[PDB]
mmCIF file of N, CA, C and O and ligand atoms in Angstrom:
data_model
loop_
_atom_site.group_PDB
_atom_site.id
_atom_site.type_symbol
_atom_site.label_atom_id
_atom_site.label_comp_id
_atom_site.label_asym_id
_atom_site.label_seq_id
_atom_site.Cartn_x
_atom_site.Cartn_y
_atom_site.Cartn_z
ATOM 1 N N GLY K 860 0.809 -1.197 0.000
ATOM 2 C CA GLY K 860 0.000 0.000 0.000
ATOM 3 C C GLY K 860 0.847 1.252 0.000
ATOM 4 O O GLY K 860 1.847 1.335 -0.716
ATOM 5 N N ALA K 861 0.460 2.216 0.814
ATOM 6 C CA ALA K 861 1.186 3.472 0.923
ATOM 7 C C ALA K 861 1.647 3.675 2.358
ATOM 8 O O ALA K 861 1.535 2.765 3.180
ATOM 9 N N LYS K 862 2.165 4.853 2.663
ATOM 10 C CA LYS K 862 2.563 5.166 4.020
ATOM 11 C C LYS K 862 1.958 6.495 4.414
ATOM 12 O O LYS K 862 1.772 7.381 3.576
ATOM 13 N N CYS K 863 1.651 6.616 5.685
ATOM 14 C CA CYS K 863 0.955 7.769 6.209
ATOM 15 C C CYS K 863 1.769 9.034 6.009
ATOM 16 O O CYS K 863 2.985 9.034 6.168
ATOM 17 N N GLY K 864 1.086 10.092 5.602
ATOM 18 C CA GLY K 864 1.706 11.401 5.544
ATOM 19 C C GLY K 864 2.058 11.927 6.925
ATOM 20 O O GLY K 864 2.786 12.914 7.055
ATOM 21 N N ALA K 865 1.534 11.273 7.955
ATOM 22 C CA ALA K 865 1.852 11.618 9.331
ATOM 23 C C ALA K 865 2.717 10.531 9.958
ATOM 24 O O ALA K 865 3.817 10.801 10.441
ATOM 25 N N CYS K 866 2.219 9.297 9.923
ATOM 26 C CA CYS K 866 2.930 8.165 10.502
ATOM 27 C C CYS K 866 4.123 7.758 9.643
ATOM 28 O O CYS K 866 4.256 8.154 8.487
ATOM 29 N N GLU K 867 4.979 6.951 10.235
ATOM 30 C CA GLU K 867 6.000 6.217 9.509
ATOM 31 C C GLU K 867 5.463 4.819 9.245
ATOM 32 O O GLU K 867 6.172 3.916 8.793
ATOM 33 N N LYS K 868 4.180 4.674 9.556
ATOM 34 C CA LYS K 868 3.458 3.429 9.399
ATOM 35 C C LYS K 868 2.783 3.400 8.035
ATOM 36 O O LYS K 868 2.703 4.418 7.338
ATOM 37 N N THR K 869 2.282 2.240 7.664
ATOM 38 C CA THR K 869 1.645 2.054 6.379
ATOM 39 C C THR K 869 0.172 2.456 6.395
ATOM 40 O O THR K 869 -0.526 2.282 7.396
ATOM 41 N N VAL K 870 -0.289 2.994 5.277
ATOM 42 C CA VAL K 870 -1.696 3.307 5.087
ATOM 43 C C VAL K 870 -2.297 2.330 4.094
ATOM 44 O O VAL K 870 -1.686 2.025 3.066
ATOM 45 N N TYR K 871 -3.480 1.831 4.399
ATOM 46 C CA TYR K 871 -4.132 0.884 3.519
ATOM 47 C C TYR K 871 -5.449 1.461 3.074
ATOM 48 O O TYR K 871 -5.843 2.528 3.544
ATOM 49 N N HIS K 872 -6.146 0.748 2.217
ATOM 50 C CA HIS K 872 -7.464 1.176 1.782
ATOM 51 C C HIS K 872 -8.419 1.207 2.983
ATOM 52 O O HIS K 872 -9.452 1.874 2.955
ATOM 53 N N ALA K 873 -8.031 0.501 4.047
ATOM 54 C CA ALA K 873 -8.804 0.441 5.285
ATOM 55 C C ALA K 873 -9.166 1.835 5.793
ATOM 56 O O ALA K 873 -10.320 2.102 6.123
ATOM 57 N N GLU K 874 -8.183 2.722 5.842
ATOM 58 C CA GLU K 874 -8.427 4.081 6.295
ATOM 59 C C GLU K 874 -7.613 5.087 5.485
ATOM 60 O O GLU K 874 -7.004 6.001 6.036
ATOM 61 N N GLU K 875 -7.630 4.923 4.171
ATOM 62 C CA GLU K 875 -6.874 5.802 3.292
ATOM 63 C C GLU K 875 -7.694 7.009 2.861
ATOM 64 O O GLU K 875 -8.714 6.873 2.176
ATOM 65 N N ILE K 876 -7.254 8.182 3.273
ATOM 66 C CA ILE K 876 -7.746 9.416 2.699
ATOM 67 C C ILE K 876 -6.649 10.021 1.842
ATOM 68 O O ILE K 876 -5.556 10.317 2.330
ATOM 69 N N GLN K 877 -6.926 10.175 0.561
ATOM 70 C CA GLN K 877 -5.951 10.730 -0.356
ATOM 71 C C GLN K 877 -6.133 12.235 -0.470
ATOM 72 O O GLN K 877 -7.041 12.714 -1.149
ATOM 73 N N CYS K 878 -5.267 12.975 0.201
ATOM 74 C CA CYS K 878 -5.308 14.425 0.161
ATOM 75 C C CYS K 878 -4.134 14.941 -0.655
ATOM 76 O O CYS K 878 -2.981 14.590 -0.378
ATOM 77 N N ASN K 879 -4.442 15.747 -1.674
ATOM 78 C CA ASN K 879 -3.439 16.299 -2.587
ATOM 79 C C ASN K 879 -2.805 15.188 -3.422
ATOM 80 O O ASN K 879 -3.138 15.013 -4.595
ATOM 81 N N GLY K 880 -1.922 14.424 -2.801
ATOM 82 C CA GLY K 880 -1.271 13.324 -3.473
ATOM 83 C C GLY K 880 -0.624 12.372 -2.490
ATOM 84 O O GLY K 880 0.284 11.626 -2.847
ATOM 85 N N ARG K 881 -1.096 12.401 -1.252
ATOM 86 C CA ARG K 881 -0.533 11.575 -0.197
ATOM 87 C C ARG K 881 -1.646 10.849 0.545
ATOM 88 O O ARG K 881 -2.717 11.413 0.781
ATOM 89 N N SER K 882 -1.396 9.598 0.888
ATOM 90 C CA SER K 882 -2.351 8.807 1.644
ATOM 91 C C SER K 882 -2.205 9.072 3.142
ATOM 92 O O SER K 882 -1.126 8.902 3.716
ATOM 93 N N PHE K 883 -3.283 9.521 3.757
ATOM 94 C CA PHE K 883 -3.312 9.754 5.190
ATOM 95 C C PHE K 883 -4.287 8.793 5.844
ATOM 96 O O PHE K 883 -5.279 8.400 5.231
ATOM 97 N N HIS K 884 -3.999 8.397 7.073
ATOM 98 C CA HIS K 884 -4.956 7.623 7.851
ATOM 99 C C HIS K 884 -6.158 8.493 8.168
ATOM 100 O O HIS K 884 -6.015 9.698 8.360
ATOM 101 N N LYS K 885 -7.337 7.894 8.223
ATOM 102 C CA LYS K 885 -8.527 8.616 8.654
ATOM 103 C C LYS K 885 -8.322 9.135 10.072
ATOM 104 O O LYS K 885 -8.869 10.163 10.460
ATOM 105 N N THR K 886 -7.494 8.428 10.827
ATOM 106 C CA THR K 886 -7.157 8.826 12.179
ATOM 107 C C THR K 886 -6.042 9.876 12.204
ATOM 108 O O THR K 886 -5.704 10.401 13.263
ATOM 109 N N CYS K 887 -5.480 10.185 11.043
ATOM 110 C CA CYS K 887 -4.385 11.149 10.955
ATOM 111 C C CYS K 887 -4.702 12.267 9.964
ATOM 112 O O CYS K 887 -3.840 13.077 9.641
ATOM 113 N N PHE K 888 -5.940 12.313 9.495
ATOM 114 C CA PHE K 888 -6.330 13.277 8.470
ATOM 115 C C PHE K 888 -6.634 14.645 9.077
ATOM 116 O O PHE K 888 -6.838 15.629 8.365
ATOM 117 N N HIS K 889 -6.654 14.716 10.393
ATOM 118 C CA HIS K 889 -6.984 15.963 11.060
ATOM 119 C C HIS K 889 -5.750 16.847 11.209
ATOM 120 O O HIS K 889 -4.639 16.422 10.901
ATOM 121 N N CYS K 890 -5.960 18.066 11.693
ATOM 122 C CA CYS K 890 -4.948 19.114 11.643
ATOM 123 C C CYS K 890 -3.612 18.671 12.225
ATOM 124 O O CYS K 890 -3.531 18.152 13.346
ATOM 125 N N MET K 891 -2.574 18.868 11.425
ATOM 126 C CA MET K 891 -1.207 18.565 11.815
ATOM 127 C C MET K 891 -0.667 19.603 12.789
ATOM 128 O O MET K 891 0.264 19.326 13.545
ATOM 129 N N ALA K 892 -1.243 20.799 12.764
ATOM 130 C CA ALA K 892 -0.719 21.905 13.558
ATOM 131 C C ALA K 892 -1.278 21.910 14.977
ATOM 132 O O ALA K 892 -0.511 21.969 15.942
ATOM 133 N N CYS K 893 -2.601 21.860 15.117
ATOM 134 C CA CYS K 893 -3.195 21.749 16.442
ATOM 135 C C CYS K 893 -3.605 20.305 16.692
ATOM 136 O O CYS K 893 -2.823 19.526 17.232
ATOM 137 N N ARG K 894 -4.818 19.968 16.275
ATOM 138 C CA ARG K 894 -5.300 18.590 16.274
ATOM 139 C C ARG K 894 -6.774 18.524 15.865
ATOM 140 O O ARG K 894 -7.388 17.457 15.917
ATOM 141 N N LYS K 895 -7.330 19.660 15.436
ATOM 142 C CA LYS K 895 -8.740 19.745 15.071
ATOM 143 C C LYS K 895 -9.089 18.762 13.956
ATOM 144 O O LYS K 895 -8.327 18.595 13.004
ATOM 145 N N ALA K 896 -10.243 18.113 14.084
ATOM 146 C CA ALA K 896 -10.720 17.175 13.075
ATOM 147 C C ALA K 896 -11.233 17.920 11.844
ATOM 148 O O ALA K 896 -12.181 18.705 11.935
ATOM 149 N N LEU K 897 -10.604 17.672 10.699
ATOM 150 C CA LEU K 897 -10.965 18.353 9.459
ATOM 151 C C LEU K 897 -11.995 17.570 8.658
ATOM 152 O O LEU K 897 -12.087 16.347 8.759
ATOM 153 N N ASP K 898 -12.770 18.300 7.871
ATOM 154 C CA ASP K 898 -13.732 17.717 6.951
ATOM 155 C C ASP K 898 -13.321 18.063 5.522
ATOM 156 O O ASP K 898 -12.491 18.951 5.329
ATOM 157 N N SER K 899 -13.908 17.385 4.539
ATOM 158 C CA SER K 899 -13.531 17.532 3.131
ATOM 159 C C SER K 899 -13.360 18.997 2.701
ATOM 160 O O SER K 899 -12.387 19.347 2.034
ATOM 161 N N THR K 900 -14.292 19.850 3.099
ATOM 162 C CA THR K 900 -14.302 21.223 2.617
ATOM 163 C C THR K 900 -13.681 22.195 3.630
ATOM 164 O O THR K 900 -13.454 23.367 3.323
ATOM 165 N N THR K 901 -13.377 21.716 4.827
ATOM 166 C CA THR K 901 -12.870 22.600 5.864
ATOM 167 C C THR K 901 -11.347 22.519 5.996
ATOM 168 O O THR K 901 -10.723 23.430 6.541
ATOM 169 N N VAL K 902 -10.753 21.442 5.488
ATOM 170 C CA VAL K 902 -9.298 21.301 5.505
ATOM 171 C C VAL K 902 -8.645 22.247 4.506
ATOM 172 O O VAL K 902 -9.074 22.350 3.356
ATOM 173 N N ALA K 903 -7.619 22.948 4.959
ATOM 174 C CA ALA K 903 -6.869 23.843 4.100
ATOM 175 C C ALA K 903 -5.512 23.239 3.774
ATOM 176 O O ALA K 903 -4.635 23.145 4.637
ATOM 177 N N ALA K 904 -5.354 22.808 2.535
ATOM 178 C CA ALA K 904 -4.107 22.223 2.086
ATOM 179 C C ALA K 904 -3.373 23.163 1.136
ATOM 180 O O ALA K 904 -3.973 23.753 0.233
ATOM 181 N N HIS K 905 -2.078 23.308 1.359
ATOM 182 C CA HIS K 905 -1.240 24.142 0.514
ATOM 183 C C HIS K 905 0.091 23.451 0.254
ATOM 184 O O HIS K 905 0.841 23.171 1.189
ATOM 185 N N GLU K 906 0.357 23.169 -1.020
ATOM 186 C CA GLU K 906 1.593 22.523 -1.458
ATOM 187 C C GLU K 906 1.676 21.087 -0.952
ATOM 188 O O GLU K 906 1.331 20.154 -1.674
ATOM 189 N N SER K 907 2.115 20.915 0.287
ATOM 190 C CA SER K 907 2.230 19.590 0.881
ATOM 191 C C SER K 907 1.698 19.585 2.313
ATOM 192 O O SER K 907 1.750 18.565 3.005
ATOM 193 N N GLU K 908 1.179 20.724 2.755
ATOM 194 C CA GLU K 908 0.749 20.870 4.135
ATOM 195 C C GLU K 908 -0.769 20.948 4.231
ATOM 196 O O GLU K 908 -1.419 21.570 3.392
ATOM 197 N N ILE K 909 -1.319 20.315 5.260
ATOM 198 C CA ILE K 909 -2.761 20.315 5.504
ATOM 199 C C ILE K 909 -3.044 20.678 6.960
ATOM 200 O O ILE K 909 -2.494 20.068 7.879
ATOM 201 N N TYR K 910 -3.881 21.692 7.164
ATOM 202 C CA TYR K 910 -4.233 22.133 8.509
ATOM 203 C C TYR K 910 -5.679 22.595 8.556
ATOM 204 O O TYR K 910 -6.360 22.647 7.528
ATOM 205 N N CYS K 911 -6.144 22.918 9.757
ATOM 206 C CA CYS K 911 -7.436 23.552 9.923
ATOM 207 C C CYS K 911 -7.329 25.020 9.510
ATOM 208 O O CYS K 911 -6.226 25.546 9.338
ATOM 209 N N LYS K 912 -8.468 25.684 9.366
ATOM 210 C CA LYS K 912 -8.485 27.080 8.934
ATOM 211 C C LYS K 912 -7.943 27.999 10.025
ATOM 212 O O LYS K 912 -7.639 29.163 9.773
ATOM 213 N N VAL K 913 -7.810 27.465 11.234
ATOM 214 C CA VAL K 913 -7.298 28.239 12.357
ATOM 215 C C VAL K 913 -5.779 28.341 12.280
ATOM 216 O O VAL K 913 -5.217 29.432 12.341
ATOM 217 N N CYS K 914 -5.117 27.201 12.124
ATOM 218 C CA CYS K 914 -3.666 27.179 12.004
ATOM 219 C C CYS K 914 -3.230 27.736 10.657
ATOM 220 O O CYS K 914 -2.168 28.348 10.540
ATOM 221 N N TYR K 915 -4.055 27.520 9.639
ATOM 222 C CA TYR K 915 -3.817 28.111 8.333
ATOM 223 C C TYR K 915 -3.865 29.631 8.449
ATOM 224 O O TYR K 915 -3.024 30.336 7.893
ATOM 225 N N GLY K 916 -4.840 30.125 9.206
ATOM 226 C CA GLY K 916 -4.957 31.550 9.446
ATOM 227 C C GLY K 916 -3.964 32.046 10.483
ATOM 228 O O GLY K 916 -3.866 33.246 10.735
ATOM 229 N N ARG K 917 -3.253 31.113 11.101
ATOM 230 C CA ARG K 917 -2.176 31.448 12.017
ATOM 231 C C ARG K 917 -0.876 31.629 11.242
ATOM 232 O O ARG K 917 -0.240 32.676 11.313
ATOM 233 N N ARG K 918 -0.501 30.600 10.488
ATOM 234 C CA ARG K 918 0.744 30.619 9.730
ATOM 235 C C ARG K 918 0.662 31.596 8.561
ATOM 236 O O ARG K 918 1.587 32.367 8.324
ATOM 237 N N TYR K 919 -0.445 31.554 7.835
ATOM 238 C CA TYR K 919 -0.640 32.444 6.700
ATOM 239 C C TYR K 919 -1.510 33.623 7.113
ATOM 240 O O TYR K 919 -2.191 34.235 6.287
HETATM 241 ZN ZN1 ZN T 948 -1.276 7.601 10.343
HETATM 242 ZN ZN1 ZN T 949 -5.224 23.492 13.466
#
């Protein structure tokens, strides 16, 4: 399969969310910056980074 964009562990179709071009665990698809649970339209991804609109509005 693939490997988590967060974990060093493997991602399978079991809990694969493909964001941008990387497979993330459904358990790891939430904000990398804080920890807020993101939804399809609420996640802000830029280049290779994915965060909530709060941390996105923090960094950017
Ligand atoms: Zn993971
Ligand atoms: Zn956040």
